[PDB]
């Protein structure tokens, strides 16, 4: 058997849940897993195409094999932590700054 | 753009995605495939900083 070469039509004994949008939850389309926010789509896709790669070679939009709806993929891992303190000799307070 | 292309190379492995190898190989046997992806990226990061 092959791995990731054609639209899903065999697979194995796996059920299905509901579809939630505007959330950074884990998804699983065509066996390939991932983590990102699934929102609306405004691009153009052909009926015989499923996955899609950009310049970074990352699945940004996968087609739902259940409803044939294009959903964009965008991970919420976008931030940083930076603590700024004036010094322990003055006071004992800090300032939480995000990147 | 050079570091972006390093994420797609296998560096002598079977897959360049960390979510794909774990879904097909058991941890006690996938240690030989994850090490090839980590070692292949340390050379690009060391060269970039240099």
């Amino acid at each position: 058997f092959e791995l990731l070469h054609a639209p899903a039509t065999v697979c194995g004994p796996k059920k299905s849940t509901n579809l939630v949008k505007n959330k950074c939850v884990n998804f699983n389309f065509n066996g390939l897993t991932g983590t990102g926010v699934l929102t609306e789509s405004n691009k153009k896709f052909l009926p015989f195409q499923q996955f899609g790669r950009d310049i970074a070679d990352t699945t940004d939009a996968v087609r739902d094999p259940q409803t044939l709806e294009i959903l964009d993929i965008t991970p919420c891992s976008f931030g940083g932590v930076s603590v700024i303190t004036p010094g322990t000799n003055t006071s004992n307070q800090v300032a939480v700054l995000y990147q | 753009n050079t570091l972006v292309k390093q994420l797609s190379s296998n560096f002598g492995a079977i897959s360049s995605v960390l979510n794909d190898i774990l879904s097909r190989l058991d941890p006690p046997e996938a240690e030989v495939q994850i090490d090839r992806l980590i070692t292949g990226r340390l050379q690009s990061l060391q060269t970039y900083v240099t």
């Binding site: 950009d54 970074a56 990352t58 976008f78 940083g80 | 972006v4 994420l7």
Partner: peptide, 28 residues
């Protein structure tokens, strides 16, 4: 409206993927 001269505005036009690169660790 800006605090620049006409010479500085002419040189700015001579010297001319934002969030996609930041999804891997490239923080500007």
């Amino acid at each position: 409206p800006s605090k620049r001269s006409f010479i500085e505005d002419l040189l700015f036009n001579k010297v001319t993927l934002i969030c996609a690169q930041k999804f891997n660790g490239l923080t500007v």
